[PDB]
């Protein structure tokens, strides 16, 4: 099953959402196999790119594996997996990595503020609110 | 087991996708009055006070 | 016989027209309910779309 999942991940499908769903299914199978750390490692390896990756996911010129770091569904699944498995430091690192790709919506900023407030942090919630205000000024 | 280690704050467990604020805004989850909730009862209270003052003057 | 008489381009055009009609119906339902549809879209945009629209 792992070999088939790796072969499907190495298959350049047309839709990047299909590859994200395959990675999420592999992570769910690993989590059901008591390998949540391995699932988080596989999710991090799927969403692996440089520090300044700017490839557009909507551009139909690159492969779906290359245009997979800007997947909001895979990033949300990785954040949900790491929220109940790791501490607040890894959650902050995942939030910083999501903000580096500029794929975080206002709902993502609200979730980051709620996660900061749940960890007895009010200045960090104000910082996340300032980040949400600065990233999108007028309407959003 | 899959739906046991997730925060369920931004990912929909039924639709298997990201949550959207068009149908489930986060402002309904607040325990206090937001800015949309505020500045509406104060105007109603001011209007009621003005109506009471007008009735007392009449 | 029904599938061979319907080209994939025609199916894609019909799907796009249905999506446009569904978006128009959702906008009409949001406007008839007294809510602002632009804010409902504005809840969940990404950053890059926000600089693009600005
Ligand atoms: C804050 N923010 C980004 C933002 N805020 C907005 O208020 C807003 C947008 N973006 N709009 C843009 O229109 C595209 C959809 O086309 P369409 O089918 O809707 O175009 P039609 O055809 O017209 C969307 O990609 C969106 O970017 C449209 N719009 C009103």
Beta-strand portion of chain C reads under 5%
Q: Fraction of residues of chain C in helices?
A: over 70%
User: Would you count the extended β strands of chain C for me?
Assistant: 0
The count of strands of chain A amounts to: 0
Backbone CA Rg of chain C: 17 Å
Strand content of chain A: under 5%
Secondary structure tally, helices of chain A: 7
Give the N-to-C terminal Cα separation of chain C: 49 Å
Order of helices and strands of chain C: HHH
Alpha carbon gap, first and last residue of chain A: 43 Å
Main sheet attributes: strand count, strand direction, barrel closure of chain A:
none
Biased composition (Basic and acidic residues) (chain B): 35-52
Subunit structure (chain C): May be part of a spliceosome complex.
Subcellular location (chain C): Nucleus
Function (chain C): Involved in pre-mRNA splicing.
Task: Furnish the topology, listing elements before pairings.
This is part of a larger assembly, with chains A (140 residues), B (58 residues) and C (54 residues).
Chain A lengths: L1 H8 L6 H17 L3 H11 L25 H12 L4 H13 L5 H13 L4 H13 L5
Helix pairs in contact in A: 1-2, 2-3, 3-4, 4-5, 6-7
Chain B lengths: L10 E2 L4 E2 L22 H17 L1
Antiparallel strand pairs in B: 1-2
Chain C lengths: L7 H25 L4 H6 L4 H7 L1
